[PDB]
Design a protein around this ligand. Structure first.
Ligand code: COH
Ligand code: COH
Ligand SMILES: *[C@@H]1O[C@H](CO)[C@@H](O[C@@H]2O[C@H](CO)[C@@H](O)[C@H](O)[C@H]2NC(C)=O)[C@H](O)[C@H]1NC(C)=O
Ligand SMILES: *[C@@H]1O[C@H](CO)[C@@H](O[C@@H]2O[C@H](CO)[C@@H](O)[C@H](O)[C@H]2NC(C)=O)[C@H](O)[C@H]1NC(C)=O
Ligand SMILES: Cc1ccc(-c2cc(C(F)(F)F)nn2-c2ccc(S(N)(=O)=O)cc2)cc1
Ligand SMILES: Cc1ccc(-c2cc(C(F)(F)F)nn2-c2ccc(S(N)(=O)=O)cc2)cc1
Ligand SMILES: CCCCCCCCO[C@@H]1O[C@H](CO)[C@@H](O)[C@H](O)[C@H]1O
Ligand SMILES: *[C@@H]1O[C@H](CO)[C@@H](O)[C@H](O)[C@H]1NC(C)=O
Ligand SMILES: *[C@@H]1O[C@H](CO)[C@@H](O)[C@H](O)[C@H]1NC(C)=O
Ligand SMILES: *[C@@H]1O[C@H](CO)[C@@H](O)[C@H](O)[C@H]1NC(C)=O
Ligand SMILES: *[C@@H]1O[C@H](CO)[C@@H](O)[C@H](O)[C@H]1NC(C)=O
Lengths: 552, 551
């Protein structure tokens, strides 16, 4: 079989077959050498001893609040610290991208073809003896068995950081613009050829879909008015293909950028908020530029809302996740004197780790009601009956589930959580400890080190035998959470660079784009640099209800 | 009308309307400020003082040959100068790209839609009173008159640098992988969504076309053997769509990556050569990796040829073009410690300046024959009759025409030259002087300064009335050439950044790609780093004839 099946090359060294049963490791710019790239250079040997562990870094960022209070209020220091945050993890991500599900080696097909999700690690070769390479049994444990033993939820576990439903639905809405998996081809393929924050879930992936959603007046998007309230247009009026069960009323079949946003009222909530924000920005720009035509009012507004989305995600969404005392800042200027590629390619592993099913509650508490999944699905009437204001007020108060720690996936979505395990095996992912080493983390030496607990670790060991063949996705959900946090180490050290890559890698963050003229002048620019999840809701939802990503 | 038709903002400042009759300049990171971004800051005054003119920089690289011969033999020193060359033009090209033919302002459509050629300068607004903005008459002079008076060829004017027909066809074959105008949409649209050196003119633009060209054994491409010589396969054999006149027999319809390479035997030459080179690399890779399957042999071979092409283009093609005594070097490691975007977007203006019609001869001299244009087109039988070796031997000694200097466009392609002017106007190009200011050059004050003579300059002033409304393309052909050189100043200062970005911006030049393992080991890596126009011909053409881009 393939001589690289055992994954011998360490420290980002690249493995290559030299014969039928011999290999060679490419230690180019790894900082190491030797047959397996395990012998470090002198300078490398220094960089290792002086490198702080991720847990050491996390402690500092979550403690000494009196010190960060000083820093956060010194713009020079804040920008300086943030400059480090954004330049810290420096080569963890291949850009331009490399492998994908069909190529364990670099090729032009893998680079050019935008339909593929890219891969941080190459897949396991087909003719490898065991699923994870050479270690482990001839077969991985039954996925259902793994699901029910350590993943499925017994009793609802709240998020100790206090994440609410405003957060959970934002995460689903925001990420499903670049996590558009194309099941017609397979789990390794995507429909989001933009590979990042292009707001295609609001405007549409194709130009043909966009023009059906547009009004072609003042740059706005088509809309309807129900009970004096602005809601998205219908499938019938725009002739936009959406995903709805046949038994859904015509006027409740809303049409938006993403075909699947009719699935959940919480998504339609955000789909409605952003539609209003777009038309709001149109109004502001038309006031500033009465000379502009419809097309320019539209395009400029889209770039503005893109900036808003990136602004909010960093300084609200990621800030809440981090739990840091340090105030994250969105300022593209901090990369202009740095080496950074203004491009991005969505990793399949970035998709996989973002399956935060445990975030979901058992019921959805709106006003005085508590709907179940069977009731909540495709019930756009709920959104209408209650209104956006009561949606915001209710979802700001309702707590969300904990992602890590194990056993918190709702039974309602068991078929989805299991599908994540199966498709991870279809795309032939490498093991948990292989992705830890890939992102400069110490491999787990025991299942009890992974979960920090004896019970699930016992069950996991009986299922997998070896810790070195533990799978990625279930490990992320059963991993020992950081102190009073929502994630474990692996979720963060892998997730942080992937997230910040698609955010800062956007063209509007480039020097030639990051100008007032790009966004219609100082007015449009100001909309972005002052945007927040609070202001978003305050400007578009009636009554301006208080909101946040935390229940407090 | 649009408040920015007059092009008020200077020094890379961006113009924005703030009403029906007013505008506003964005002077961000220009080094200037004021209403029109024209008042220089202090550090700029320092840098504008120290800045040497391109005319004198070109002088240095073309003189003191004895000293360059020394520098060319000091690795550390060759390397360091080539690094400067790659970085001497830090912010000339927008990357990620900005405007196109439909968007004179930044937008997500202009950025994401890869069907567009990008634009170095935004188009003139639709409601502008004069074709160039506010200057000049209501209409530009008839393109036919501009064509006949100062563009068409009387006496054939040969290239002083000694460019041969190997050069002329290489330039045509090489650039037509990223110059594929989608004429079903317009001149501002491209069919090459790769926007760079992807060698799709060999392997095909889409995956389907590629699989119809591949043999699926040993990673090789389909081929036929005619008289012991290897040639591309037929359209019948591959079902690959090719552009041929109806009177071309089924056996002479060669199928290659590019759909239009069949029309010119000079292109079908390199198409055959590069197809041979591909299968040669597969042979080598197969005995380096007898364990490898077909798919990896192909994909790895495509990367090496991409590397070869960039290697050959820089150190042979661009080298001969420049005329510099300094020996250029293809070394991606020179950009690792520098701010560089490993991405590219083909500019429309890059396409326009590359319309080197004057490079063409009056006849195509092969062995004992002098073929006219009418005889040469679609005549792949010429290729079979003489052979590759006679083709290389003959095209090596046949000289090419001078691009700049005026009056050198062959009569046989006058319609094409007229189309370059018509379409530039169709795409609403800005004037010559605007594109000069865009590239840190000084605007021409008179037509005599532009041409360096009196006769043609008098002709153009009768046509255009103002030097500030002189079009970009016809100027490139009549511009005063550098001393015994093929190009004028504008052709160089525009084309040099565009060419260097398209080559180095290739993902294989990125640090994670520039590894021996990417190309199948040290053997395949050396194939890239030792590639040349002579080795390409020697390894693939029978007899290994001597060739270059000169003599
Ligand atoms: C990040 C938060 C999040 C939440 C709250 C959430 C909540 C819910 C939810 C609530 C009622 C339902 C019915 C589903 C059900 C699904 N989810 Co999510 N999912 C989430 C993250 C994801 C991600 C990431 C994907 C993969 C995107 C893709 O492939 O299209 C996904 C995909 C899916 C799919 C596509 C099938 C597949 O093979 O991927 C279904 C069905 N889902 N999920
Ligand atoms: C650089 C060398 C070169 C050579 C030797 C050459 C030789 C020849 C030749 C016979 C040998 C003929 C019949 C033509 C004729 C044409 N050329 Co050129 N061309 C050249 C440079 C170019 C370039 C560059 C383009 C742009 C291709 C595009 O935009 O699709 C081009 C485009 C064309 C087109 C497309 C239509 C148009 O541009 O309006 C035609 C027709 N032509 N050319
Ligand atoms: C890139 O832009 C072109 C031109 O704007 C788009 O082509 C148009 O597509 C619409 C339908 O989507 C047709 O009705 C038009 O006739 C097309 N115009 C031309 C000139 O062909 C193209 O779809 C865009 N590409 C993407 C990926 O959105
Ligand atoms: C990207 O890759 C996919 C899969 O490798 C290509 O889709 C295949 O296309 C061929 C011919 O076009 C079909 O015969 C296959 O059935 C397709 N496979 C799948 C899974 O869809 C796709 O064409 C590639 N993209 C581009 C632009 O070439
Ligand atoms: C999917 C994902 C994963 C991590 C991040 C991220 C990014 C950052 C920052 F600051 F670097 F931008 N922190 N940060 C983060 C840090 C700590 C936690 S915690 N308290 O659960 O362990 C959670 C998130 C974002 C998205
Ligand atoms: C279309 C085009 C234009 C310029 C170049 C180019 C690039 C370079 C280099 F080396 F800097 F990269 N020089 N160089 C160049 C420089 C001078 C001349 S010359 N003797 O006609 O005036 C000719 C070419 C290449 C292609
Ligand atoms: C909660 C709905 C799914 C339950 C499936 C149970 C499958 C066996 O799961 C068992 O459940 C017990 C209690 O949680 C644990 O003590 C055991 O460790 C575990 O193996
Ligand atoms: C390299 O790894 C292999 C495992 O495949 C091991 O047998 C060998 O001893 C290692 N060699 C070195 C020098 O570490
Ligand atoms: C939600 O759907 C259920 C049945 O599908 C229905 O009884 C209920 O009225 C709906 N919610 C609202 C607010 O109408
Ligand atoms: C700017 O240019 C305009 C012409 O477009 C001119 O009228 C104006 O006086 C200029 N202003 C300055 C400060 O140079
Ligand atoms: C070229 O074509 C002409 C007809 O257009 C034909 O007579 C001639 O034989 C061809 N050249 C060769 C070498 O066959």
């Amino acid at each position: 079989h393939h001589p690289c099946c055992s994954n011998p090359c360490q420290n980002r060294g690249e493995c290559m077959s030299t014969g039928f049963d011999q290999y060679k490791c490419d230690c180019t710019r790894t900082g190491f050498y030797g047959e397996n790239c395990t012998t470090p250079e002198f300078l490398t040997r220094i960089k290792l001893l002086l490198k702080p562990t991720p847990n050491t870094v996390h402690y500092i960022l979550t403690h000494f609040k009196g010190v960060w209070n000083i820093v956060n209020n010194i713009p020079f220091l804040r920008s300086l610290i943030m400059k480090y945050v954004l330049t810290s993890r420096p080569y963890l991500i291949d850009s331009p991208p490399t492998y994908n599900v069909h190529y364990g080696y670099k090729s032009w097909e893998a680079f050019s073809n935008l339909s593929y999700y890219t891969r941080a690690l190459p897949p396991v070769a087909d003719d490898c003896p065991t699923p994870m390479g050479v270690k482990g049994n001839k077969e991985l444990p039954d996925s259902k068995e793994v699901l029910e033993k350590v993943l499925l939820r017994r009793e609802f576990i709240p998020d100790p950081q206090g994440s609410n439903m405003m957060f959970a639905f934002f995460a689903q809405h925001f990420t499903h613009q670049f996590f558009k998996t194309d099941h017609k081809r397979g789990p390794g393929f995507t429909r989001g050829l933009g590979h990042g924050v292009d707001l295609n879930h609001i405007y549409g992936e194709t130009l043909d879909r966009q023009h059906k959603l547009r009004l072609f007046k003042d740059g706005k998007l088509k809309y309807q008015v129900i009970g004096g309230e602005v809601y998205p247009p219908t499938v019938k009026d725009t002739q936009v293909e959406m995903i709805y069960p046949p038994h859904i009323p015509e006027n409740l079949q809303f049409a938006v950028g993403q075909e699947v946003f009719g699935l959940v009222p919480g998504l339609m909530m955000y789909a409605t908020i952003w539609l209003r924000e777009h038309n709001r920005v149109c109004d502001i720009l038309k006031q500033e530029h009465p000379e502009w035509g419809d097309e320019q009012l539209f395009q400029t507004s889209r770039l503005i809302l893109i900036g808003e989305t990136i602004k909010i995600v960093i300084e609200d969404y990621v800030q809440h996740l981090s739990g840091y005392h340090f105030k994250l800042k969105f300022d593209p200027e901090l990369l202009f004197n740095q080496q950074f590629q203004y491009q991005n390619r969505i990793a399949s592993e970035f998709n996989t780790l973002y399956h935060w099913h445990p975030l979901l509650p058992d019921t959805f508490n709106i006003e005085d009601q508590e709907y179940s999944f069977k009731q909540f699905l495709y019930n756009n009437s709920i959104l209408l009956e209650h209104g956006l204001t009561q949606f915001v007020e209710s979802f700001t108060r309702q707590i969300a589930g904990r992602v890590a720690g194990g056993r918190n996936v709702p039974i309602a979505v068991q078929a989805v959580a299991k599908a994540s395990i199966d498709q991870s095996r279809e795309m032939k992912y490498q093991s948990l400890n292989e992705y830890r080493k890939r992102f400069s983390l110490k491999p787990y030496t025991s299942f009890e080190e992974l979960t920090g607990e004896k019970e699930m670790a016992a069950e996991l060991k009986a299922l997998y035998s070896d810790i070195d063949v533990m799978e990625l996705y279930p490990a992320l959900l059963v991993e020992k959470p950081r102190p009073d946090a929502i994630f474990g180490e692996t979720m963060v050290e892998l997730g942080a660079p992937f997230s910040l890559k698609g955010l800062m890698g956007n063209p509007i963050c480039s020097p030639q784009y990051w100008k007032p003229s790009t966004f219609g002048g100082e007015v449009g620019f100001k909309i972005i640099n002052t945007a927040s999840i609070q202001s978003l809701i305050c400007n578009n939802v009636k009554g301006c209800p208080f909101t946040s990503f935390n229940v407090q």
